[PDB]
Amino acid sequence: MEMLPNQTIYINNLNEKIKKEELKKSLYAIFSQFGQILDIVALKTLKMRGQAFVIFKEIGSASNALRTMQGFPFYDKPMQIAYSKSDSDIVAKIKGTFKERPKK
Numbered sequence: 719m720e721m722l723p724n725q726t727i728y729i730n731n732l733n734e735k736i737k738k739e740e741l742k743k744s745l746y747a748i749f750s751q752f753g754q755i756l757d758i759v760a761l762k763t764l765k766m767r768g769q770a771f772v773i774f775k776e777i778g779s780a781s782n783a784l785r786t787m788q789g790f791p792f793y794d795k796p797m798q799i800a801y802s803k804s805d806s807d808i809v810a811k812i813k814g815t816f817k818e819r820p821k822k
Contacts, residue, residue, distance in 0.1 A: 720785075721781055721784050721785055721788075721800070721801045722781075722801055722804070723777035723778060723780065723781045723801070724777060724780060724801040724802050724803050724804070725756075725773055725774060725776070725777050725780055725802075726771055726772065726773045726774070726780065726801075726802035726803075727771070727772055727774065727780055727783065727784045727799055727800070727801055727802060728769075728770075728771050728799065728800050728801070728802050728805040728806065728807070729769065729770040729771070729772065729797060729798070729799050730768065730769050730798050730799070730800070730806070731768060731795050731796065731797055731798035732760075732767065732768050732769065732770060732792070732793065732795070732797075733768075733793040733794055733795045734764065734767040734768045735767075736767065736793060737762060738760045738761055738762050738766075741758070741760045741770055742758050742760070744792065744793075745758050745770075745772055746758075748787075748792070749772060749783050749787060752779075752782055752783040752786045752787060753774045753775060753776075753778075753779030753780060753782045753783040754774065754775040754779060755772055755773070755774055755775070756773045756774055756775055757772070757773040758770070758771075758772045758773070759771040759772070759773075769806075771802065780801070781801070784799050784800075784801060787799060
């Protein structure tokens with residue numbers, strides 16, 4: 719398994735205690751050392767406490783950050799990361815579950 723370049727990466731095993739602000743600072747503190755971030759998206763709601771997205775300078779820099787930080791103990795949990803546009807948001811869009819009701 720090897721990732722493919724995309725300007726955005728998706729993170730899905732953050733320690734859920736981490737606030738949006740703490741995620742933002744920790745990404746700026748460490749993940750920018752591995753490619754320079756351009757933008758960050760997480761939320762204080764539980765649905766984005768273990769999960770985040772982050773947009774990088776260039777697709778190669780995004781790839782470098784992703785692969786280097788994959789499995790890294792960024793907190794008391796090893797990170798799990800993928801490149802965007804091959805991640806749960808697009809999977810939910812093609813399933814419809816992004817916006818469809820579970821039943822009518």
